[PDB]
Amino acid sequence: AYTNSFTRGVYYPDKVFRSSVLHSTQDLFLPFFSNVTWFHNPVLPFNDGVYFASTEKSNIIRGWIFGTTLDSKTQSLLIVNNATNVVIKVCEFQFCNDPFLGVNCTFEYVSKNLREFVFKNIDGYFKIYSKHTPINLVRDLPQGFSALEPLVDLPIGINITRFQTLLAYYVGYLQPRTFLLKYNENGTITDAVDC
Amino acid sequence: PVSMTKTSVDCTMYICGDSTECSNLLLQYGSFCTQLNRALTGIAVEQDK
């Protein structure tokens, strides 16, 4: 299944404040009006970066796995939100062929709806941006525009080329595109142009 | 149109803003700094004229 990435997958590329200005920036973004793969939990590549989105009514999706082999051989990322707490670990975990949830750890951290995330892995840093929005749609991604603020920057230095999800959702692949971003008075990105 | 904006630039401060190592290197280039100031000053006086 495939759907249209209308204007989604814009994130603040840097931590800089800018107001009432159009700034041109080259980085890994989700190309406008591209094909996003639609899923109702296989293993997917991580070419240079991933745009994940999930439409949720009951918070079925919980986590992500990232790495190269993801079979207790090498370092791999596991990210999990369990009902109250977020957990991140980078152990060489022994995963099942079809891991899920019921109804050498070199790092550890503990903390109707659309949840959009961007994962990218640059200079050994794992950058995670996200945005939560209310929606009234059961078919596909809402058309419109909203920016993703960074949430986490993990200094892992771990090679990732593949990933998988842990529980419907959509996947897009980022590309090195130049964008023009419109920052309003409040420093929020309100519109963008794919150059 | 009759006049422009009478801009002036301090070459030193532009190139080597508040840096001593940079300034000492810049001295080796001679009068570039001075001649740019001089040219722009020329422009500004022309604007008034």
Binding site: Y12, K15, V16, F17, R18, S19, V21, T106, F107, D123, G124, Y125, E149, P150, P155, I156, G157, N186, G187, T188 | S8, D10, T12, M13, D18, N37, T41
Partner: protein, 291 residues
């Protein structure tokens, strides 16, 4: 530099200045003080875990603790008076506070006093050969202090062991924990002790009455690592007080400059650190300690 007319004369390279107005110099306010601001020190490295450990490992089975993703306060160590040996090779302790590293390894073990000398680059002996070897290019610190009060008891503490025989010398940071019967002769032992068949390990005699040379010493060896990865072990990088409405030389988390810092009315987003102008010029910051 006598008087402005002289500055003029020098600028024009003449003794005779014609009537006019001459641009001679450039007025620039000098910064009065230096401001350094970094975020509140948080997530200290677990040095306590290693130094304040209740029990230590034997030298042949020396413990290795990995230190990562934390702020390493070396001051608490090199300013402490609890250490007899604080030797650092190819690095100064004080400087460590200004440095980041990918990984730090705290190798902890116990030896006798006279063997402390073997824990150094280019040393030989039972310890340096069969138990714990430092590389010739070691660039870390060795900390050792007497532990007679803890690791000695009336009648002799024999919990601490050392390897007495080995078929070859250890490589730098090699760990051998094998208990294979040492074949001193030509006859295979087949895991049976006897003539030319000896157990490779032996106990230390740690009594409170023992000579300082034979008294137990706790040793921590800090090794510093720079990989193809982010440096996650950094020093405290101490801050200063903040001064407003003055020309200052400021340093915020990454960025330096010179200016006058004033109360702004800008509305940064919770994640935005420093603001910019049209001309990609830093115009505003967020103080890391006070938002």
């Amino acid at each position: 530099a006598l008087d402005p007319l002289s500055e003029t004369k020098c600028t024009l390279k003449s003794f005779t200045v014609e009537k006019g107005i001459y641009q001679t110099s450039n007025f620039r306010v000098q910064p009065t003080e230096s401001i350094v601001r970094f975020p509140n020190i948080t997530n200290l490295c677990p040095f306590g875990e290693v130094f304040n450990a209740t029990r230590f490992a034997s030298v042949y089975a020396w413990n290795r603790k990995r230190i990562s993703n934390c702020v390493a306060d070396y001051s608490v160590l090199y300013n402490s008076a609890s250490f007899s040996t604080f030797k650092c090779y190819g690095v100064s302790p004080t400087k460590l506070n200004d440095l980041c590293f990918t990984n730090v390894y705290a190798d902890s073990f116990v030896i006798r006093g006279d063997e402390v000398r073997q824990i150094a680059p280019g040393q030989t002996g039972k310890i340096a050969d069969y138990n714990y070897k430092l590389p010739d290019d070691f660039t870390g610190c060795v900390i050792a202090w007497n532990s007679n009060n803890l690791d000695s008891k009336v009648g002799g503490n024999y919990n601490y062991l050392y390897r007495l025989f080995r078929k070859s010398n250890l490589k730098p940071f090699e760990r051998d924990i094998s208990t294979e019967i040492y074949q001193a002769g030509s006859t295979p032992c087949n895991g049976v002790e006897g003539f030319n068949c000896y157990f490779p390990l032996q106990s230390y005699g740690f009594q409170p009455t023992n000579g300082v040379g034979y008294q137990p010493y706790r040793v921590v060896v800090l090794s510093f690592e720079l990989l193809h990865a982010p440096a996650t072990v950094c020093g405290p990088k101490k801050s200063t007080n903040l001064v407003k409405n003055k020309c200052v030389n400021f340093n915020f988390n990454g960025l330096t400059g010179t200016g006058v810092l004033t109360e702004s009315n800008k509305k940064f987003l919770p994640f935005q650190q420093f603001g910019r102008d049209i001309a990609d010029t830093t115009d505003a910051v967020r103080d890391p300690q006070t938002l």
